[PDB]
């Protein structure tokens, strides 16, 4: 209450309202544009233009004004749509100065009863794709019966170029940490030392191409967010787990975070290069979960995985769509081979 309160200064006309907002754009969830795909085999959502010669119709017999519709093939539309969306997503990711990798996984798709409504059994593909984008009611669980490895090697692994490299039956641990703001992933050695400390994965392109009674494939594109190396170094001196003779325990201090999921992994690797610089890698994981938080993961699980590598230079030189087409082509083979035992003695896929 000082300084000539009865003489208000003349307020300049060049004053427009301004606001300050913090954290509006920052955040792991709001990082990159996303996309989605929901694809069912034995589909043909397209029509083909054709023309015929109708010279037996009295009245307008000219064939110029004749137009007719025809059917199409099944796989071409799915492959074209998938390749186009993959190309657009990879172009955007390379435009944002980021790196990412392609991923191929085998398992099954399960949906909550929320998607179904009013006892309807025929739904538009667009409607289903739009309905599965609000609450994420899908409950994908990766799995594959183990009684196929005899014929797994008999899938033209060596003829294509897949060869067993490195050392097999490697023992390791995979765990996750829930920090104050984000999530982190830690790879622990058999001894107990942390191998790598990375950030949570973000999926840019999602594809859920279903299949017949056999397993279905869920092609994905992934990117890895940055992480402060101060936090990388910090999670190397403080012990995370302590390994007794049989049991394993968690020692992570409460101030640093919390252990929410840790499992034991038996890993082996196979590698292929198809004279193009592309590294198609197959990995084996017979994981047995140890420390769980949610309820739907309490069982031994053996699953397969295929991967490639696309650095931040494919926007100018490397043909991105070729790798996706090759991966989709060679995933169908392995889907077909293990289709029988996936429903014969283990599993039940009654699609009717």
């Amino acid at each position: 209450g000082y300084g000539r309160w009865n003489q208000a200064s003349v307020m300049q006309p060049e004053t427009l309202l301004d606001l300050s907002q913090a954290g509006f754009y920052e955040g792991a969830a709001n990082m990159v544009p996303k996309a989605f795909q929901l694809l069912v085999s034995d589909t043909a959502p397209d029509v083909v233009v054709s023309r015929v010669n109708t010279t037996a119709f009295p009245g307008f017999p000219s064939n110029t004004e004749c137009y007719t519709l025809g059917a199409s093939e099944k796989d071409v539309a799915i492959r074209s749509r998938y390749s186009k969306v993959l190309q657009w997503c990879c172009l955007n990711m390379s435009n944002l100065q980021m790196d990412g990798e392609l991923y191929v996984d085998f398992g099954k798709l399960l949906l909550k009863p929320s998607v179904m409504r009013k006892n309807r059994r025929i739904v538009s593909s667009y409607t289903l794709q739009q309905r599965l984008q609000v609450n994420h009611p899908y409950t994908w669980v990766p799995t594959l019966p183990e009684s196929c490895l005899s014929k797994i090697q008999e899938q033209f692994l060596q003829p294509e170029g897949f060869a067993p490299i490195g050392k097999g039956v490697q023992l390791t641990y995979s765990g996750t940490i829930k920090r104050s703001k984000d999530q982190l992933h830690v790879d622990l050695d058999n001894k107990g030392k942390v191998l790598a400390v990375n950030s949570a994965w973000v999926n840019l392109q999602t594809a859920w191409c279903t299949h017949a009674k056999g397993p279905d494939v869920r092609l994905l594109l992934r990117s890895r967010p940055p992480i402060r190396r101060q936090d990388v170094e910090l999670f190397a001196s403080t012990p995370i787990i302590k390994l007794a003779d049989d049991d394993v325990a968690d020692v992570l201090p409460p101030e640093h975070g919390q252990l929410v999921y840790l499992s034991e992994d038996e890993t082996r690797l196979f590698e292929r290069v198809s004279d193009r610089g592309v590294t198609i890698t197959v990995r084996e994981v017979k994981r047995q979960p140890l420390i769980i938080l949610r309820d739907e993961e309490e069982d031994p699980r053996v699953e397969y995985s295929l991967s490639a590598h696309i650095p931040a230079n494919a926007a100018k030189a490397t043909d991105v769509r070729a790798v996706g087409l090759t991966a989709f082509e060679l995933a169908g083979r392995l889907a077909g081979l293990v289709a029988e035992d996936f429903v014969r003695e283990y599993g039940c896929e009654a699609k009717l």
Binding site: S20, Q21, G23, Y25, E26, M31, P33, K34, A35, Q37, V40, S41, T43, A44, P45, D46, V47, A71, R81, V85, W88, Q97, K108, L109, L110, L111, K112, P113, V115, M116, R121, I122, V123, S124, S125, Y126, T127, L128, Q130, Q133, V134, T139, V141, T143, T210, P226, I227, R228, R229, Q230, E296, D299, P300, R301, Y346, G347, C348, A350, K351, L352
Partner: protein, 190 residues
């Protein structure tokens, strides 16, 4: 400083008007690596570095974001002389599913001859409709407590065509009953 400060982070901070929430070494590293400046005296305080970063960012920004919501003559364009969103893949269209059940037919808002009030194209070989079915996931490793789980299965085109036909037929019956006109039905071959 380190690798966590990238173009996306600085762009977001600039767009939210909070660039001052950064340390001097971070700004110096950003100017020395991203903006590619000649050299920076390791004595400048926050204001000079912030102003330099801001000017460099604004000068190199040339992708216009505004769309002119007005009409203007003297503009010459040669272009004529949704498709990506037709499949509905690049996001979740806000305000969907909150509409009358008119997905199977095209209805646009009196007597007029040769004026179809509702068109519905159909086909036998090609049908754009997927189906759902129940399964028992008890075997699967983790779903040992749920008895029913739905999976997406393709369906025969004829059943979908019949379903669309009856869905249109009930609507037509209700409409013609509300109007109470003399009703006729024709099935022509040709």
């Amino acid at each position: 400083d380190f690798s966590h400060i990238t173009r996306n982070t600085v762009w977001g901070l600039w767009n939210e008007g909070n660039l001052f929430s950064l340390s001097v070494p971070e700004l110096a590293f950003f100017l020395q690596e991203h903006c590619r400046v000649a050299n920076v005296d390791p004595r400048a305080k926050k204001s000079a570095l912030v102003r330099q970063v801001e000017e460099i960012l604004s000068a190199e920004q040339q992708a216009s974001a505004t769309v002119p919501q007005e009409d203007n003559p003297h503009a010459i364009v040669v272009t004529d002389y949704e498709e990506a969103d037709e499949y509905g893949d690049w996001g979740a269209e806000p305000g969907f599913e909150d509409r009358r059940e008119l997905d199977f037919m095209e209805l646009s808002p009196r007597y007029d001859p040769l004026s179809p009030r509702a068109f519905q194209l159909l086909h036998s070989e090609t049908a754009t409709d997927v189906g759902i079915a129940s399964i028992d996931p008890s075997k699967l490793p983790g779903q040992s407590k749920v008895k029913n789980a739905l999976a997406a299965i393709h369906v025969a085109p004829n059943d979908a065509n019949k379903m669309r036909f009856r869905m249109a037929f009930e609507w037509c019956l209700m409409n013609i009953w509300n109007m109470n006109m003399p009703g006729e039905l024709n099935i022509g071959a040709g």
